[PDB]
Amino acid sequence: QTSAVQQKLAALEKSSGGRLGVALIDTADNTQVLYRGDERFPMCSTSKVMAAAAVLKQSETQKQLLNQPVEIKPADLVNYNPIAEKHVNGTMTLAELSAAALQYSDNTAMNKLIAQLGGPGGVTAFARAIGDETFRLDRTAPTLNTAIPGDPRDTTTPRAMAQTLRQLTLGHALGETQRAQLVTWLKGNTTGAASIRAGLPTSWTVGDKTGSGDYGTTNDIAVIWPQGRAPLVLVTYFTQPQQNAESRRDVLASAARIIAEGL
Length: 263
Ligand SMILES: [K+]
Fold this sequence. Notes:
Layout: H1 4-16, E1 19-26, E2 31-35, E3 41-42, H2 48-59, E4 69-72, E5 90-93, H3 94-104, H4 107-116, H5 120-129, E6 155-156, H6 158-169, H7 176-187, E7 205-213, E8 217-225, E9 232-239, H8 249-261
Antiparallel strand pairs: 1-2, 1-9, 3-6, 4-5, 7-8, 8-9
The structure holds potassium ion (K).
PDB class: hydrolase
Assembly: monomeric
Name: Beta-lactamase
């Protein structure tokens, strides 16, 4: 069946000329709203949530892991590293690298998290451990953002990522301390105001992770606390036919607004 919400998301998708994938979980009743929910999309930087959560899971058996220094060398700098470049020829802790990756989308910081997990396949291993059979990380930053149509590398489905984000932030995939840390980090995101958040009422509070890549790929994954409602999880993924296409955060906002109106 096609709901009124799915009809409005299809109309939005048409006007955009790209491809849109949406997955909502409403924890009030565990109901789901999906648009292209089982199609694969490039994750781009939304993958940083899985990498930071995998290190948080390691910290459950190592009290001092998050305080562990990691050397930052000039050769470690990549395309976008606004926090790591200040610590070149110094160190950042795994807590600092996690925060920089999630709240500033620092790509050097994500590469340290990946290196701490033994490479991209270590992030995929953690996804499988928490019951995500869809997620795959294949590359480091920035080449995991190539977002080539039809490429299975560094992809997931909206349905899979909404379920995983729910487990990580509201469920018991992490210990209580670690779950709270991940939520604090997401809530402190600096990059999300033009994406999901822009489509929701101001009074609602959001923790989110954005992503952007080639093919005008514009993504956001969010945990939403509506005024007077149980929390929501929302995934919005958007990708465009042309390698050089512009970002379209406003499409994610428009998708979020349709979803909110549909509650
Ligand atoms: K782009």
